[PDB]
Amino acid sequence: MLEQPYLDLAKKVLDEGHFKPDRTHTGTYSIFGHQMRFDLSKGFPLLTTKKVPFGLIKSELLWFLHGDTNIRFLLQHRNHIWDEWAFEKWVKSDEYHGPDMTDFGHRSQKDPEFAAVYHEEMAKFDDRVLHDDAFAAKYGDLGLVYGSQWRAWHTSKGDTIDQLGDVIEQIKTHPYSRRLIVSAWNPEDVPTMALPPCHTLYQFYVNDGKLSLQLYQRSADIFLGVPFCIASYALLTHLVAHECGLEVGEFIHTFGDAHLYVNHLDQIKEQLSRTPRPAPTLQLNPDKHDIFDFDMKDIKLLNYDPYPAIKAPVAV
Amino acid sequence: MLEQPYLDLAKKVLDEGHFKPDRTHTGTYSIFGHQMRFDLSKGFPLLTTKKVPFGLIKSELLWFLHGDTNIRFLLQHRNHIWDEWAFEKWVKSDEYHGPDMTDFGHRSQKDPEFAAVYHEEMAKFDDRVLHDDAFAAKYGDLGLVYGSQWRAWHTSKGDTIDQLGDVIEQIKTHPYSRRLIVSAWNPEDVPTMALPPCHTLYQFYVNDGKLSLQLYQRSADIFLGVPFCIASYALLTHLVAHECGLEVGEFIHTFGDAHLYVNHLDQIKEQLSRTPRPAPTLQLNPDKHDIFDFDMKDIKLLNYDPYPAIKAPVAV
Numbered sequence: 001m002l003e004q005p006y007l008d009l010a011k012k013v014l015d016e017g018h019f020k021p022d023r024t025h026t027g028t029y030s031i032f033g034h035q036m037r038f039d040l041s042k043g044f045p046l047l048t049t050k051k052v053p054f055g056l057i058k059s060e061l062l063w064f065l066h067g068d069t070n071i072r073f074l075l076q077h078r079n080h081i082w083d084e085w086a087f088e089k090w091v092k093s094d095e096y097h098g099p100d101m102t103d104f105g106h107r108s109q110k111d112p113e114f115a116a117v118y119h120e121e122m123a124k125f126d127d128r129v130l131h132d133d134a135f136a137a138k139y140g141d142l143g144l145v146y147g148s149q150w151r152a153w154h155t156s157k158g159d160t161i162d163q164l165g166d167v168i169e170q171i172k173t174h175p176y177s178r179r180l181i182v183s184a185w186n187p188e189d190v191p192t193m194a195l196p197p198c199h200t201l202y203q204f205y206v207n208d209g210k211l212s213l214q215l216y217q218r219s220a221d222i223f224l225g226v227p228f229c230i231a232s233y234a235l236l237t238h239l240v241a242h243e244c245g246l247e248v249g250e251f252i253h254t255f256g257d258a259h260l261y262v263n264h265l266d267q268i269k270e271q272l273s274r275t276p277r278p279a280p281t282l283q284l285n286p287d288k289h290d291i292f293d294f295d296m297k298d299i300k301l302l303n304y305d306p307y308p309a310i311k312a313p314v315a316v
Numbered sequence: 317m318l319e320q321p322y323l324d325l326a327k328k329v330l331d332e333g334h335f336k337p338d339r340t341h342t343g344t345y346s347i348f349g350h351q352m353r354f355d356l357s358k359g360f361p362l363l364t365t366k367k368v369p370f371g372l373i374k375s376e377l378l379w380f381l382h383g384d385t386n387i388r389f390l391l392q393h394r395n396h397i398w399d400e401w402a403f404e405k406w407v408k409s410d411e412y413h414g415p416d417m418t419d420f421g422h423r424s425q426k427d428p429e430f431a432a433v434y435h436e437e438m439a440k441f442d443d444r445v446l447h448d449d450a451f452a453a454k455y456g457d458l459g460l461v462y463g464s465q466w467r468a469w470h471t472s473k474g475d476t477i478d479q480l481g482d483v484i485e486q487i488k489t490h491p492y493s494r495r496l497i498v499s500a501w502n503p504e505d506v507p508t509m510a511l512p513p514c515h516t517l518y519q520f521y522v523n524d525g526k527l528s529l530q531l532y533q534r535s536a537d538i539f540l541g542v543p544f545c546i547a548s549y550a551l552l553t554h555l556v557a558h559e560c561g562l563e564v565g566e567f568i569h570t571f572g573d574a575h576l577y578v579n580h581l582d583q584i585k586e587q588l589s590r591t592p593r594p595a596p597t598l599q600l601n602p603d604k605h606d607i608f609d610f611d612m613k614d615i616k617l618l619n620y621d622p623y624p625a626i627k628a629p630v631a632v
């Protein structure tokens with residue numbers, strides 16, 4: 001079945017992975033260097049052995065395609081994937097007047113009544129961002145995030161390059177170019193960056209009338225991170241090919257540090273006992289073309305029957 | 317034997333590769349997405365089925381490590397790997413007064429007496445660069461080349477970042493970092509770059525006391541390019557590990573567009589009839605540590621017995 005490569009990656013780390021202490025401090029099992037490919041002509045690589053929220057995947061993707069970096073857009077789409085980063089700056093800043101929302105990321109998970117306090121302050125910040133234009137502009141803009149990297153790279157001479165935009169035109173005029181690259185790694189920002197991009201860089205390739213994309217991910221959370229990632233980039237591969245009028249080829253996922261957090265072992269072993277179901281089908285609005293103008297109703301995921309979801313603690 | 321992966325890549329392209337027209341215009345057979353690893357603890361991955369000039373590999377590598385971008389250094393090391401690029405600017409410029417060295421890259425290979433004229437003008441330029449300080453500074457500096465990318469990345473606010481330098485310190489203090497990346501791809505230079513970097517970006521990894529490096533190469537000439545590349549980066553992996561006091565792990569080569577030029581088919585098939593010999597051994601000067609201060613006598617390649625060299629036309 002289409003998702004097998006992922007299952008084999010999980011098995012692999014679990015069997016051949018060596019223990020490696022980590023940044024967050026909850027040790028991992030890791031392998032360095034891995035590559036797996038999915039033939040997008042067979043279906044959409046959205047995991048069926050575990051429920052994955054596609055809606056969160058696309059709203060976040062459209063956010064990137066708009067070159068948007070403001071959390072407000074996601075919020076009106078009920079996506080809260082990036083709230084924490086915005087909250088971080090806000091809480092550790094002048095205006096924040098309230099409880100000790102310091103180190104909230106761990107203390108919340110721990111157990112205290114603090115969870116309510118945190119979740120409340122967050123709920124608060126979230127409403128401000130969504131209605132207070134000055135606040136949104138001040139605390140909701142994350143700045144250097146995938147949207148600005150892909151669509152507004154900062155030139156040395158104070159300007160803006162739309163990488164992804166330029167790359168799409170290239171695929172249209174010079175489909176056989178070996179230079180169709182989009183990079184998110186900027187040497188000058190990473191030294192003091194919150195979380196340097198995990199999806200470091202990707203490359204397009206055209207031949208036989210099919211489009212393929214290869215992503216280089218410096219670091220990956222096999223359990224929590226990879227599933228979303230495979231889908232997000234498989235979606236991109238479809239969108240661009242829809243714009244360029246090409247057929248979809250494969251999606252190739254190359255890893256640097258592929259890893260499984262020790263406290264995800266039971267959960268991953270739960271997944272491994274399940275057997276894949278037929279891959280779901282994706283269909284884009286046949287009318288619309290300029291993917292930048294794409295809207296959520298323009299993307300559909302036909303018949304997806306996944307096993308229930310599996311819960312597991314986040315590590316940051 | 318250690319070099320088998322390369323042989324399997326060549327077989328693979330030759331058997332499974334699809335034809336793809338190319339930039340230079342001498343069609344290729346290509347595959348998209350490939351990864352191969354070499355266990356550096358077994359020997360040095362310098363091809364034995366075909367003679368590869370190691371001396372050219374290291375003089376070019378030391379040139380990179382010095383953050384040097386001037387052709388003069390290589391010339392005093394009898395390395396002429398980058399002369400063409402320097403000649404290009406020089407010939408198509410004010411001062412050049414002489415024959416029609418225009419489009420020299422093809423006309424030279426073709427057959428005319430021109431080869432002598434070209435080779436003479438080149439021989440001329442080469443002597444100027446090596447002795448005329450004003451000329452060297454004007455026409456010998458290539459500018460944006462691996463040396464400046466690795467060791468003097470240009471900040472937006474007009475400054476210089478020594479990526480590789482910083483990364484080595486990181487490996488020394490935070491060996492388990494998943495952010496040990498060195499990128500050569502700058503979105504603002506590639507639009508109007510002669511030849512955007514093929515060795516796009518690499519990543520370091522440490523665990524078990526061994527250092528590993530993974531290189532992402534957007535485009536590769538299996539026949540002429542890959543052999544050198546594998547060695548150059550295997551050398552780097554040894555040097556850095558010598559500085560950091562780590563044991564050597566593997567070298568992982570990830571490709572984007574792995575390709576074989578149609579006019580290299582016979583030659584590659586020559587190689588494929590040979591059987592690998594034991595991998596050579598590399599040993600660095602045990603005294604010296606700051607690799608930046610490394611000199612050629614500080615690197616040695618013990619017992620390398622390759623089959624003769626194979627000749628093949630260059631395509632640019």
Ligand SMILES: Nc1ccn([C@H]2C[C@H](O)[C@@H](COP(=O)(O)O)O2)c(=O)n1
Pocket residue numbers: 023195196198199219220221222224225226493494495
């Ligand atoms: N889109 C993302 C973002 C993060 N991570 C993971 C990678 C690491 O597990 C951790 C980030 O830590 P580090 O900077 O050390 O890689 O989160 C991931 O798998 N996918």
Ligand SMILES: Nc1ccn([C@H]2C[C@H](O)[C@@H](COP(=O)(O)O)O2)c(=O)n1
Pocket residue numbers: 177178179339511512514515535536537538540541542
């Ligand atoms: N160090 C290098 C430099 C170049 N090439 C090859 C890659 C392509 O075959 C051609 C450059 O063309 P392009 O820009 O289209 O990739 O030269 C290579 O294999 N290794």
